[PDB]
Design a protein around this ligand. Structure first.
Ligand SMILES: OCCc1ccccc1
Ligand SMILES: OCCc1ccccc1
Ligand SMILES: OCCc1ccccc1
Ligand code: NA
Ligand code: NA
Lengths: 333, 332
């Protein structure tokens, strides 16, 4: 098990991670977008300042590290991550992998080539910065496309060679997690190296627990996502859902109750800029959840405690689980 | 418009000289080159390859090239500026959107896209101050809803700035007709537009009817041929099975029908190409070792041999590009 986690400011020891949000973003965009059209966000400086305010408030609430799951295709700008991390004094773990908007240069690649690209970002550094990714993000939106199966396979190969974990975006509704697990296992990846994300997007407790029993980490990262009260905004309802934050949060207690407290990872899946959706989605979202990344520690944790979840289980979920997941871990020979 | 914007700054119209109007330093994807430069060996190797090729094209008489790589073709203006300076060849950069826009672009309105194109033309690309001198758009058969928005924004940006629009077409499907209709619906003058990849079709009637309306016809795929590589499906699909002589003859055909002033010729070459199968670059380089120098070293002489006069060849390679590139607003 690795003693250090790579962050945008360099390696940190496992104990330095502390309370960690495992699925967040500084900015949800597209490759090259922030640099070619920063004005879409007011300005690069305005976006950085917003991110610094948010990260400082989240830090005030106890968050010590966030995992920015923005891949190349989410328009991840590591320089921006490094700048905000330093200004707000919050650890930020960067990601490699590919989401669902890969451009042609990526979509035409073989599993072997993609493996090399993920390894480059983890081992040598993203772009020419030397900033090394500490996680691999992948995704499916229903049955995987042929390209998506290749990405999952490359992600598994990169994880097996480096020990860095894999985290995913799923259509929880469709039970994407099972197909994802299938692919990963076909590559020999240990389930403990994988977090099946957006799992609170569904009430299927059956699905969730079956994956947990196999060793997978379950990502309940859309807790504050809700279009309740905005049933009239189609784009918003489509993205956020009509289930309440309490409904989603209750899934955490359910999994704990079923005996899988060690496999749960909680997050907000928040961001400070969002260009890969309708214009104005950021504003809508910020009105929905003004606490932003602080929602987890300020609302969710107290809610669960009020529901009977003990202190130690809450601490285990927010500190222990993320540390074990993030610690680079190679499969035993 | 007395000046054309290049990656090294503005040049007078006369300084453009012999110009290739549809080329690329590298055919890629947004952020690709910076994130995975080893795909091309290294950024340095790519730059060096580009400088060698531009120097050879320059030796053959090329003074300027128009790199029609848009944001989504992975245009890296810093690379363009570096190679332009090292080889001493003017390079005109482009704005616009090709056929691989990411979500952040695909979800935008015509109004939003218009401001993005204007940003690139008027103020500068990224934080470099390098201003685009052309707008590139594309369709591959009937336009998608998004492509119609892109074409409309391109026309709006062209009307406000005077910079021309150039396109990628599925020529055999007559895309230029729909493109022209959309452009015309926005009030853009056909003389501000080049319907590209026109040599991909043998339908002279389609080409002369567009010429007749005032559009520029881009015969920019001259050296593209898979003749001899039938066995290579990817190469075949990309380059076609028509010879370079057959395509070059369309230049003569258009001249013979009276449209010499509406012809733009190029090679549609590149030094790196990641937006297709791996190894396509090597295959292409074997097919056409002359690369960008193909037009001046083989096509011009071929046309001359076929009877095209000196003056017409000079007009097509110098005059036409100058007229097209000179920013021109619609009269009031
Ligand atoms: O507008 C400044 C508000 C702010 C102050 C300090 C840290 C986060 C928020
Ligand atoms: O030892 C049990 C402490 C703990 C509880 C919840 C999740 C991880 C660790
Ligand atoms: O008569 C003008 C000379 C000329 C020839 C071909 C194209 C542009 C100009
Ligand atoms: Na590493
Ligand atoms: Na300009």
């Amino acid at each position: 098990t690795g003693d250090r986690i790579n962050t945008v400011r360099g390696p940190i020891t496992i104990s330095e991670a502390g309370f960690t949000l495992t699925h967040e973003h500084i900015c949800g965009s597209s490759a090259g977008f922030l640099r070619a059209w920063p004005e879409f966000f007011g300005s690069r400086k305005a976006l950085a300042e917003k991110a610094v305010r948010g990260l400082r408030r989240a830090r005030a609430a106890g968050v010590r590290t966030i995992v920015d799951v923005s891949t190349f295709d989410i328009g991840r700008d590591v320089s921006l991550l490094a700048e905000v991390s330093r200004a707000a004094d919050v650890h930020i773990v960067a990601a490699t992998g590919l989401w669902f908007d890969p451009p042609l240069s990526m979509r035409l690649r073989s599993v072997e080539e993609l493996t090399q690209f993920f390894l480059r970002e983890i081992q040598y550094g993203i772009e020419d910065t030397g900033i090394r990714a500490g996680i691999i993000k992948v995704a499916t939106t229903g049955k995987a496309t042929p390209f998506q199966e290749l990405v999952l396979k490359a992600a598994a190969r990169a994880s097996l060679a480096t020990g860095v974990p894999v985290t995913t975006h799923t259509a929880a509704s469709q039970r994407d997690g099972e197909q994802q697990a299938a692919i990963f296992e076909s590559e020999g990846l240990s389930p403990s190296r994988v977090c099946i994300g957006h799992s609170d997007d569904t009430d299927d407790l059956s699905y969730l627990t079956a994956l947990a029993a196999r060793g997978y980490l379950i990502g309940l990262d859309h807790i504050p996502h809700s279009a309740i009260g905005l049933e009239d905004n189609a784009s918003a309802s489509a993205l956020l859902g009509i289930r309440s934050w309490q409904t989603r949060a209750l899934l955490i207690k359910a999994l704990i109750d079923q005996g899988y407290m060690k496999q749960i990872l909680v997050s907000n899946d928040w961001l400070f800029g969002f260009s890969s959706y309708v214009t104005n989605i950021m504003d809508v979202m910020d009105r929905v959840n003004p606490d932003g990344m602080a929602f987890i520690p300020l609302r969710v944790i107290p809610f669960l405690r009020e529901k009977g979840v003990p202190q130690e289980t809450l601490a285990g979920i927010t500190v222990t689980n993320p540390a074990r997941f993030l610690s680079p871990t190679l499969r035993a020979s």
